[PDB]
Amino acid sequence: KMALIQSVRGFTPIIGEDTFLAENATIVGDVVMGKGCSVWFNAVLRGDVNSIRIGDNVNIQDGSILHTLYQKSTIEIGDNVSVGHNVVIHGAKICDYALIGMGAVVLDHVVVGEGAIVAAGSVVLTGTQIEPNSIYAGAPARFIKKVDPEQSREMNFRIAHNYRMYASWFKDE
Amino acid sequence: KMALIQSVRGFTPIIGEDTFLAENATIVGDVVMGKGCSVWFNAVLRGDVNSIRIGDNVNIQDGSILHTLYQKSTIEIGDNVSVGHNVVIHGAKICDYALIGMGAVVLDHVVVGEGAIVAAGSVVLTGTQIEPNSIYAGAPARFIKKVDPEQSREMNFRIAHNYRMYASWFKDES
Amino acid sequence: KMALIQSVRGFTPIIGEDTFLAENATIVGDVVMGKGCSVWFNAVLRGDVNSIRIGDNVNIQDGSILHTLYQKSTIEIGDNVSVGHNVVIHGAKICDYALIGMGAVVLDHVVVGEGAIVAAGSVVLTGTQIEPNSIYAGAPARFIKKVDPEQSREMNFRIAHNYRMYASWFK
Numbered sequence: 001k002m003a004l005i006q007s008v009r010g011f012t013p014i015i016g017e018d019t020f021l022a023e024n025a026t027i028v029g030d031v032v033m034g035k036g037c038s039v040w041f042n043a044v045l046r047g048d049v050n051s052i053r054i055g056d057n058v059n060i061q062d063g064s065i066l067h068t069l070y071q072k073s074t075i076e077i078g079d080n081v082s083v084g085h086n087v088v089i090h091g092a093k094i095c096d097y098a099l100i101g102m103g104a105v106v107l108d109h110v111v112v113g114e115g116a117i118v119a120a121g122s123v124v125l126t127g128t129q130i131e132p133n134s135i136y137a138g139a140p141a142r143f144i145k146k147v148d149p150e151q152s153r154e155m156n157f158r159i160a161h162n163y164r165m166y167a168s169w170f171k172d173e
Numbered sequence: 174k175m176a177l178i179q180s181v182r183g184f185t186p187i188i189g190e191d192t193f194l195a196e197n198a199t200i201v202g203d204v205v206m207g208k209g210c211s212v213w214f215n216a217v218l219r220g221d222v223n224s225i226r227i228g229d230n231v232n233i234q235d236g237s238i239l240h241t242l243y244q245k246s247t248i249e250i251g252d253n254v255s256v257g258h259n260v261v262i263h264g265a266k267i268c269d270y271a272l273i274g275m276g277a278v279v280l281d282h283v284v285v286g287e288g289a290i291v292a293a294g295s296v297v298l299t300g301t302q303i304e305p306n307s308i309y310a311g312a313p314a315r316f317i318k319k320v321d322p323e324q325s326r327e328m329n330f331r332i333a334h335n336y337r338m339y340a341s342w343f344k345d346e347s
Numbered sequence: 348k349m350a351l352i353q354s355v356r357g358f359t360p361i362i363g364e365d366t367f368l369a370e371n372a373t374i375v376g377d378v379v380m381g382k383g384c385s386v387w388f389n390a391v392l393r394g395d396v397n398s399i400r401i402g403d404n405v406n407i408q409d410g411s412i413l414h415t416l417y418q419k420s421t422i423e424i425g426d427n428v429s430v431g432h433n434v435v436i437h438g439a440k441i442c443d444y445a446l447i448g449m450g451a452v453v454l455d456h457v458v459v460g461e462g463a464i465v466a467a468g469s470v471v472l473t474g475t476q477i478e479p480n481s482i483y484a485g486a487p488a489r490f491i492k493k494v495d496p497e498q499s500r501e502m503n504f505r506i507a508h509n510y511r512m513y514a515s516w517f518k
């Protein structure tokens with residue numbers, strides 16, 4: 001029938017208008033989402049141990065897990081963010097327009113700057129500060145290059161996931 | 174209770190005979206599967222923005238995500254393919270008897286050679302062409318070694334053949 | 348309404364007292380867990396092809412998959428173990444007080460020693476023997492350092508102890 005929505009320690013999720021929640025999504029406790037968000041199949045927004053704040057027009061893709069460290073870390077996601085399939089976001093701040101590649105893990109006290117890209121499968125170490133409009137890739141996630149301003153977010157994403165950009169020398173997704 | 178099956182843009186999943194769908198699997202939109210397939214716990218096949226085509230005796234293991242790019246990529250998976258636990262396949266072509274290792278990410282316009290093996294946890298970048306009968310590994314995935322065609326088509330077929338037996342213990346209540 | 352729990356070939360899950368099973372967890376076949384365990388959202392314990400044995404006060408976090416190889420590998424998980432979000436455990440032994448970091452893959456015949464830690468996102472190759480009180484990281488996962496045995500056990504104990512408290516907020 002509908003997404004699993006659930007109170008914990010008296011906190012009840014607050015979801016804005018025009019938000020799509022998949023039938024088998026889970027949103028639990030201290031979670032606020034803005035307007036125009038989508039939460040896809042089997043995604044889990046677990047606000048049991050600390051707070052999750054999500055802005056407007058955020059896409060949380062299938063099988064993604066959002067969690068925090070009890071009294072140590074929080075999630076703040078800004079507007080127009082894309083969180084890829086099977087991503088783990090743990091106690092991270094993600095600024096407006098940032099894209100997190102499918103399969104990535106983003107650890108606590110990470111800041112992803114406005115319009116930055118985390119490549120698919122990256123592991124972003126605790127406390128990593130990702131500059132606005134940069135691409136990070138690998139395990140651990142390292143600076144690859146500035147986002148090309150002459151191209152769109154999506155094409156910058158596609159270029160960041162092409163083997164041509166990591167050829168014979170650079171060994172990071 | 175059974176699998177979440179839904180249409181999107183009027184496309185309705187089509188499933189061959191003798192196909193196991195776990196009751197918490199999700200199959201949505203433009204998905205076509207052959208017969209002898211198995212779709213495991215919390216697998217998601219999301220054909221909402223482009224097409225997913227799957228041959229026979231394919232297992233999609235627990236927590237695996239199949240998705241595509243709007244007007245840009247499609248998924249084509251051959252027969253006797255094993256897709257591991259928590260794998261993401263995005264707009265890729267997987268030929269017969271290929272095995273995708275658990276936790277791997279396979280990106281758009283990738284072609285996985287017949288009898289090939291993507292190692293657990295690999296990230297295969299866009300327009301990687303994986304040689305048949307070869308093992309790829311790492312992030313980005315790179316050529317590690319050849320396997321004999323004999324042991325590699327047979328070996329990957331046996332994983333897919335046993336998976337049909339594991340499916341029937343749930344599907345047929347055996 | 349509640350967790351998917353099912354027999355396969357006559358093997359029926361056995362769950363200890365005081366154990367939290369999330370409404371969308373899956374526990375199937377030859378699985379035994381002890382007391383004070385928590386299985387979180389969309390976790391899958393698939394005991395269809397071989398045994399899964401889990402001791403007391405173990406948390407299996409959201410999205411994690413536990414499976415085996417038919418006739419070939421088993422899962423044995425000791426007491427006070429924390430298994431991170433979106434982890435895959437395939438046919439591995441995890442000893443008391445061990446942590447598996449989120450996003451990690453742990454393959455068949457791996458042994459994770461008492462009080463050892465697998466870093467987030469590691470891939471532990473088939474057969475890797477992880478020393479007690481050691482940190483392994485990377486893909487393939489490699490030795491990083493020793494940790495003090497008494498500190499590692501008490502820290503990892505307190506992570507498993509907090510998880511039992513988080514579980515009690517959902518009961």
Ligand SMILES: [Zn+2]
Nearest residue numbers: 067068090432
């Ligand atoms: Zn967590």
Ligand SMILES: [Zn+2]
Nearest residue numbers: 085240241263
């Ligand atoms: Zn996608």
Ligand SMILES: [Zn+2]
Nearest residue numbers: 258414415437
């Ligand atoms: Zn398996």
